[PDB]
Design a protein around this ligand. Sequence first.
Ligand SMILES: *[C@@H]1O[C@H](CO)[C@@H](O[C@@H]2O[C@H](CO)[C@@H](O)[C@H](O)[C@H]2NC(C)=O)[C@H](O)[C@H]1NC(C)=O
Ligand SMILES: *[C@@H]1O[C@H](CO)[C@@H](O[C@@H]2O[C@H](CO)[C@@H](O)[C@H](O)[C@H]2NC(C)=O)[C@H](O)[C@H]1NC(C)=O
Ligand SMILES: *[C@@H]1O[C@H](CO)[C@@H](O[C@@H]2O[C@H](CO)[C@@H](O)[C@H](O)[C@H]2NC(C)=O)[C@H](O)[C@H]1NC(C)=O
Ligand SMILES: *[C@@H]1O[C@H](CO)[C@@H](O)[C@H](O)[C@H]1NC(C)=O
Ligand SMILES: *[C@@H]1O[C@H](CO)[C@@H](O)[C@H](O)[C@H]1NC(C)=O
Ligand SMILES: *[C@@H]1O[C@H](CO)[C@@H](O)[C@H](O)[C@H]1NC(C)=O
Lengths: 321, 321, 321, 166, 164, 170
Amino acid sequence: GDQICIGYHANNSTEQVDTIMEKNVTVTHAQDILEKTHNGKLCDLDGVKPLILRDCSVAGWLLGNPICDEFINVPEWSYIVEKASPANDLCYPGDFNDYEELKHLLSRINHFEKIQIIPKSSWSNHEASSGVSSACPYQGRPSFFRNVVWLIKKNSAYPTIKRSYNNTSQEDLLVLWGIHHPNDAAEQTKLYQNPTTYISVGTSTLNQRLVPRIATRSKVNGQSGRMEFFWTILKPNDAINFESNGNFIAPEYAYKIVKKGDSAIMKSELEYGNCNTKCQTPMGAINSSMPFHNIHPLTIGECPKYVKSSRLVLATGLRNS
Amino acid sequence: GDQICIGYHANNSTEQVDTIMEKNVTVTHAQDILEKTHNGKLCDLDGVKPLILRDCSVAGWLLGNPICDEFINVPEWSYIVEKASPANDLCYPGDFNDYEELKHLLSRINHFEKIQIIPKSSWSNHEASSGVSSACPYQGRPSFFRNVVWLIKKNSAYPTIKRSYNNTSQEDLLVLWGIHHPNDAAEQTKLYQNPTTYISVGTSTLNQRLVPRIATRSKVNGQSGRMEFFWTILKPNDAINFESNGNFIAPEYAYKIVKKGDSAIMKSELEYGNCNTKCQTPMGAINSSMPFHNIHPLTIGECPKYVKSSRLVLATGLRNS
Amino acid sequence: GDQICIGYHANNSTEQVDTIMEKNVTVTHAQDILEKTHNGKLCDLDGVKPLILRDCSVAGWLLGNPICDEFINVPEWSYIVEKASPANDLCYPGDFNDYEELKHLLSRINHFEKIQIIPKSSWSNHEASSGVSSACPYQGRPSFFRNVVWLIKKNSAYPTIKRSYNNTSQEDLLVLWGIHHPNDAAEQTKLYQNPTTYISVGTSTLNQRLVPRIATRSKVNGQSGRMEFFWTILKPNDAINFESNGNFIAPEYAYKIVKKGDSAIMKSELEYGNCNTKCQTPMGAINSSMPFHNIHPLTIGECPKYVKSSRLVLATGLRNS
Amino acid sequence: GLFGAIAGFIEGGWQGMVDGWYGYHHSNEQGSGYAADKESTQKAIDGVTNKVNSIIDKMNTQFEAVGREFNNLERRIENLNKKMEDGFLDVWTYNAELLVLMENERTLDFHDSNVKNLYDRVRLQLRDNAKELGNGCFEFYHKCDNECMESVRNGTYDYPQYSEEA
Amino acid sequence: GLFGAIAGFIEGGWQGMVDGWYGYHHSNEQGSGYAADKESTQKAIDGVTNKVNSIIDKMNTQFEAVGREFNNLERRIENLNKKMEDGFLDVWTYNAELLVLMENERTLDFHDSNVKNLYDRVRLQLRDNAKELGNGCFEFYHKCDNECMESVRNGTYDYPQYSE
Amino acid sequence: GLFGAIAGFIEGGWQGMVDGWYGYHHSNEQGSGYAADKESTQKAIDGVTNKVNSIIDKMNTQFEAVGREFNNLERRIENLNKKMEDGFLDVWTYNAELLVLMENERTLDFHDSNVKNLYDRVRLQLRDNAKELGNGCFEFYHKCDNECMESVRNGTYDYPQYSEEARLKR
Ligand SMILES: *[C@@H]1O[C@H](CO)[C@@H](O[C@@H]2O[C@H](CO)[C@@H](O)[C@H](O)[C@H]2NC(C)=O)[C@H](O)[C@H]1NC(C)=O
Ligand SMILES: *[C@@H]1O[C@H](CO)[C@@H](O[C@@H]2O[C@H](CO)[C@@H](O)[C@H](O)[C@H]2NC(C)=O)[C@H](O)[C@H]1NC(C)=O
Ligand SMILES: *[C@@H]1O[C@H](CO)[C@@H](O[C@@H]2O[C@H](CO)[C@@H](O)[C@H](O)[C@H]2NC(C)=O)[C@H](O)[C@H]1NC(C)=O
Ligand SMILES: *[C@@H]1O[C@H](CO)[C@@H](O)[C@H](O)[C@H]1NC(C)=O
Ligand SMILES: *[C@@H]1O[C@H](CO)[C@@H](O)[C@H](O)[C@H]1NC(C)=O
Ligand SMILES: *[C@@H]1O[C@H](CO)[C@@H](O)[C@H](O)[C@H]1NC(C)=O
């Protein structure tokens, strides 16, 4: 007549979790902890927009590849986006010395201010606007990298160049220059007059002397010559001194490092999506409360922690009858 | 009165396991999960024989060290085996530029087809058959690396060489060459005539000018001179260009990379065992259904997971009385 | 009625431990296993005193910077202590080639014996006592690195140098030398007479030719010139051969490696504290039986294991009341 | 499960207790219904919550990958960087997955234990004054109404108050 | 033992039982013998097999060492490389060993548990119709036969039919 | 508790039992007192001791940081080295912390189980020669002098000696 029972909650739940001894155990309550979706777009990161290089490589941007002009004037960025294989790199073939160290530096930089350390108009005894190439078209016309200058002899002369620039600023200065390796000794005479040439560059730390290598090479973008580029960080109150009697690809513009901080160079194919986010991955942005995600390891922002799982479910309730 | 009891299984089992609180717990049944044994031989891997270098190094094989002729032409391989310190490396002493990076490329290559890019018979204005040395004996007589040619002046003249080879094939081509660094200026003129010399090499991506370093050094295998070797990967449809007025150790043979895939360079002292296996270690092959092993961490094939334990036993049954 | 009760221990303990479901569980007996204190000093390690570099760098010590002569004569050591930024590095500015690789070699070395391999007296056709600089004062006067010799022209000539040194001992020998890069062609003539110069260095394995580079640089320690230093390990019974016609900074003393063993280069700002320990960290020594510590990760000796935790406490007793 | 209570001696769950996690069903004079124990259901919510929050906090220091780039003559180092980033990603993935597998099993056996101890705390709060039906149920050898239920469902039910009924 | 059944109130294991891990021994009118609880001797093998398979599967994502070569002016990276590999091998050697150690404990405590719960699913049925001998046995307040057994083994033993 | 005994049906612990972890409080004609249970306390002391040593032995193979140095042209591998050492350090700190967290819980439940098991060995020995009060206590039906009490503690309580006397008090 008079009785009482002790028992436990049960319900209509489909949620399954696993344990060591049993997979697919139906439980009354669970908590998914894995975010598995993203919005498929590249976004502002907390209000600040990425520098999206489109089809330019980082070197195309910094040197000023005449197809890459869109980036002549750039605002402060939150991260940089580069395609896995950018089609515009070096219009004129050659090499960029210590390129990957430079990219590594960039990953901790949010803004540059271009400074004109040696104006093109400043070259009295050398020709400063005839160093152009069909390898580097700009608006139908043969052109060259825009931030540096390819000096050529003047009136069959190429007097020794001596130029200095002192970073009188309180910030570091990224300085680029180059040497041209001609295709043969005739082209050398044609361009620079002098048969035996050098480029020397000094800073409180830098001690460089470069000599052109004249050789016959495969044509790339129609060119058998090569351009080789160098760089250095010029510290506050240091000076940089160049000297050359030919083959010098001179700086016009340097980049002042005006803002440092958390940044990245993201490898992504995506284009700008016109939205905001607090967490970006190369495949799209993430907006979730979840502590884990399985989208991509290489994120930026406040993100959940990446895991390779396809499923992560925590049991909260009890076994469902 | 009557009786029913509830008890548990017991046996003569000696099998022991560990728990956090108790070591040597004898249980009734236990699954050992650690493979502790191998066969001690170097076997084929899924029916493919490894390339076993014996007493030759990778450089001696590739350059064609005369003592290494067993490997003049070689069948497709599954892995490569090289001793810790091979007796035959470079008969003529010197250096191999970016050797370790070349060995790294090899780890993803299963076969080469040799190709004769500059036949030794085509050097009409240079001696092509008198560049031999006692450092590199063949059948007790002065000889030289077989894949490469040590050119010498002809009639007290060494005209400037210009050669190019175009890789018309659809596979990458590994090209090797070198420079001789003589021991004194007299030797320089005896061999090459010209006192001041260079070697230029260009590929769509390579832009190289080497100069001999004439200096006095310790005898190694009787020689005070040195040879330094270089390589590049010539991509499909690229050409390579050589120019030189002395010290040139020219290619004759190059290696077309006809089979890529998974491979490895194992360092082991063992010899061929004329057997087969799915899983090979430097100490011997493994036949095993176990999930773990403790033989050696550098294995190749379908292998158990390496673990440093000396014993790993899983309890399945219950505590024995 | 007669009673017997089963129960458990309780006490006055306030010690707490954590579990996954509950924090701060007051426990009857716990066990701290985390060492959190050190003595804030640099001590002898197993009785053997460290080589404490004070304000000198390893370069300042091995080259013999005149502001560091305290380490002209050093006994066997257990580890080396260097500051993060030694005030005294290279008195005369420039670089030290493969410096970190040399530092790495030192962490396996416990004792050197300094030996004289090329007496400063033995330079008869070159000035050996005038390569001095106010950048390297000794007793207020111009001086230079003590272990190498800045040779200068004599009677308006710099004859070609050919010296050679043979390691007749049973020990590896660390040999150091350098080159001077002057700041213009005029200085090149004043100092060395010959306008075009080189330094060739050969060992059975080394094949080096150095050329001085002329560039305009900023003054560091009042100098626009730069020195660049090189090194090698000379094996027992190998010889090192030098040849130069200018700009050569010759060895005078070299270092015989007399004791190899476990050692380290520890970065610390501390000074010697006249005590002994079996476990040393950059922030102080540890005397502990604890299995863990959290003082610093870079320790030497027989130390507890490092973890980042602020607290690690293992429960031994039971829940208290 | 591990404690014999959920899906063991008590065969099934009450699809009709929206009240909470562990409870009572009483069938007596003045009506019959359900009631969840607020005491040990809340205590079990606290435990599961901290277990969730402590699992998340533990993965707070997990590895974060960083992009690095290498030229084609730095293949060895390119390969070392890759193997080591993937290395840490596999390690932390094992840690997340395994910790979840292990604590799930424990969370279940936990609920199992809470139900059991509740039964056991009532069972010896009855002694012989009631009969164990065996399926998780007790029948009273006496009379019991609602105010008799708040008494058992709270912790104190007088033993010599019905000791004589037999 | 954590649940106090194996090596506990049941003082030892029967060499005699070979049908399974847990089970029964009865001595009624007709002789005596051993019976194994098949329905939960199986749930045991199902649990243990799952656990053995789950351990191996968690491990298939292990680090694999890959040989790399360095010259004698690359000592720092050669060292970094060696430490990186040794580093992952020790992390996985740990994971494997500790998992085995923790699960061995849990596996032992799992058998221990199944035995106690078999003694409970039984005792919950009979109650006053039998006596708790103590050693893990039951003396009957009545008489049993070879068909009363299948009903106690089955878990469908009718209690009220045997009050007397 | 996971086993219902500590902080459970045995409401609290005894400040009076200075002798061990688990034990007895008797009360009879001669009087009353505490006493530890020497075997269970011992068995447990060993299991706890071993757990501590196993945990420590499990760590002696852990990662040891080594100082490495890089110049300004080697920032990429300088950064790889730093993230690798930090990464191993975090992996082992996580291991130490989690292992201690998980085993603290087990240790606590281990004691719980030991107390429950102690109580049940007694319960099974006494059988019906004693009344189960419900709070970890037994009220005897027979007379239990200090000799009879050392017997249930030693686990050698002889049931048949008191069968007859106890049967009558019922
Ligand atoms: C960069 O230009 C600045 C500005 O004149 C130079 O700075 C002065 O240098 C002198 C010594 O050389 C110091 O005593 C002054 O205090 C500096 N002035 C200021 C305002 O800082 C600097 O030397 C120049 N750099 C080079 C390499 O010539
Ligand atoms: C190597 O030879 C190949 C084949 O002759 C060259 O490729 C031809 O190149 C022209 C332009 O140079 C292309 O328009 C043709 O389509 C190519 N032919 C084929 C069949 O692909 C290649 O350029 C040569 N390489 C060098 C460095 O001269
Ligand atoms: C360095 O000096 C050693 C010792 O004088 C030279 O070695 C002797 O070398 C000859 C062969 O040339 C042998 O006959 C002796 O047995 C050697 N003795 C020792 C101690 O090895 C060595 O050749 C010299 N090195 C150089 C590069 O000239
Ligand atoms: C677990 O359930 C999922 C689908 O709900 C399925 O993929 C898998 O086969 C199941 N595993 C088992 C053990 O049946
Ligand atoms: C465990 O037993 C093995 C041999 O069977 C022995 O090596 C070891 O000493 C034993 N461990 C202990 C705790 O005695
Ligand atoms: C644990 O105790 C510490 C010390 O008082 C306190 O600061 C902390 O908040 C406590 N944690 C919890 C969860 O109560």
